[PDB]
Write a protein that binds this ligand. Structure first.
Ligand SMILES: CN(C)C(=O)N(C)[C@H]1CCS(=O)(=O)C1
Ligand SMILES: CN(C)C(=O)N(C)[C@H]1CCS(=O)(=O)C1
Ligand SMILES: [Cl-]
Ligand code: NA
Lengths: 301, 301
């Protein structure tokens, strides 16, 4: 037993990380088959970043402008193009360590593992949720750009995130591997803020099921409720609405414990109004919303 | 910026994990060079676990009682011996993925990454601390025995923990890779229970310094404390005594932030008296004690 925030084993991804230099910018690249993927803002000077014309800045560049280092070896860049906010550098050599992989776009409320990297060197791994406001609460310093997020499904790595920048509130914004931003953000030195965030309701309830499976049961009660009643409490407390889709996804956990989702919504309703009455749940004093139902079933079954 | 429980990239450890079977019992082993390390309890049956005479059980085994398996490949065992509570199986093949490694025994308060494994397959990675009562607060289901804990400082893998068992309070006990248990625990099914756990004071202080570095000042105060007055207060909250050693270790974070260690102690004393009054520090509503002074510097500017 026990319940811990757990990343996927990062080895299949560690073997894809490289360093990419263009002028006086160094950051991380993802090397799969004969392509390296990295943020397009790699081509930009501090001057350029205020109002970049990426079309124009990029035709002015050539293969020899991009320095790609896999460990202590140089990669010959033999082609370059841009897909959305992602730069694609064709290289002479196919990554001998390319795993089975897919490019996937994740939904708000879904989790993934981040492999934080510096100068193409894997540094750390942690789990993140894609917030409803389309930011993530990561841990990133200068040179972490091009670090990636992913899930693993048996042998297949599904890459879903590439890190681009930090917003002024300390939270993080990036693209899918097709270079489309998560959220209403631009890769340009301009005035940008994260929208007000909401709590991921289905994840909070997943975590309460994890708490019950681990013998933390005090918050339970004899009551039940309805979507409509609860959702009026949720909206007041900046909680995402709970749908019938959410209640079905939690079905496996409602069974395994004898607390039915609206039964558990009753407990959750009470925790929002009255608080935790000074207790903890799984060693947190907050209601944790970064574990999915899958995350809980995965770890507790 | 940001601050996260962050595990080391697990890749170098993943390439070392194998499955060990003896009788009807399967768990994980650690394959380094021509040696597979696993818990010796793998040779126990139902009766044996109450008073196992491990020397008597092992002499009755030959090499071919041990089925070892690296993915699909069977490894052939050609030798076995016991060192304390760890079984060492000699195999005909040296592991080609063997990283630069070493075995270190850690002290209470030290952190490491756990690669949770089932049937020799890595399942997830997370951070733990050796509690002052020599247990760890892990996430371990049946089959996870032989999972290891490690640091990776400067490309060398330091193995510090092999998982043996769960205590009735739902916390985890294991050995160093020389087979010596952390704490007074034993690999027999007898009435053993962890000591009362305490908070790792040096770690809480390091985390408060992390909070300041990341731009939080709300919990600072105009007070200081003697080291001795601080210890007489902190022990009333079940905090570990803070020693001159611990004060020395925080010197760098003191200098980086300009807050003297005993001033930060005055802030911790106040937080224990007051709580957080509906605020949070680095995303927590509790005082976190599983980040070392070294972890704070690795992750922070
Ligand atoms: C690399 N890149 C595009 C960035 O770092 N930014 C856009 C940041 C500058 C302030 S911001 O909030 O606009 C994000
Ligand atoms: C495999 N193995 C040796 C164990 O699981 N144990 C010794 C645990 C049973 C309850 S206990 O607290 O005695 C530890
Ligand atoms: Cl140590
Ligand atoms: Na109920």
């Amino acid at each position: 037993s026990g319940f811990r925030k757990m990343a996927f084993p990062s080895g299949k991804v560690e073997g894809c990380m490289v360093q990419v230099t263009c002028g006086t910018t160094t950051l991380n690249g993802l090397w799969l088959d004969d392509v390296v993927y990295c943020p397009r803002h790699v081509i930009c000077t501090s001057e350029d970043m205020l109002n970049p014309n990426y079309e124009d800045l990029l035709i002015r560049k050539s293969n020899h402008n991009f320095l790609v280092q896999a460990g202590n070896v140089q990669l010959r860049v033999i082609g370059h193009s841009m897909q959305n906010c992602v730069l694609k550098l064709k290289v002479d050599t196919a990554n001998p360590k390319t795993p089975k992989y897919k490019f996937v776009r994740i939904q708000p409320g879904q989790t993934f593992s981040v492999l934080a990297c510096y100068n193409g060197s894997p540094s750390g791994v942690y789990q993140c949720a894609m917030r409803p406001n389309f930011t993530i609460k990561g841990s990133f310093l200068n040179g972490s750009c091009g670090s990636v997020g992913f899930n693993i499904d048996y042998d297949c790595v599904s890459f879903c995130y590439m890190h681009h920048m930090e917003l002024p509130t300390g939270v993080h914004a990036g693209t899918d591997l097709e270079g489309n931003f998560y959220g209403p953000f631009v890769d340009r030195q301009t005035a940008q803020a994260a929208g007000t965030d909401t709590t991921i309701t289905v994840n909070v309830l997943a975590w309460l099921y994890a708490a019950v499976i681990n013998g933390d049961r005090w918050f339970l009660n004899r009551f039940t409720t309805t979507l409509n009643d609860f959702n009026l409490v949720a909206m007041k407390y900046n909680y995402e609405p709970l749908t019938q889709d959410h209640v079905d996804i939690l079905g496996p956990l409602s069974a395994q414990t004898g607390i039915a989702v609206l039964d558990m919504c009753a407990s959750l309703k009470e925790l929002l109004q009255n608080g935790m009455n000074g207790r903890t749940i799984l060693g947190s004093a907050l209601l944790e919303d970064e574990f999915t139902p899958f995350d809980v079933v995965r770890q507790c079954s």
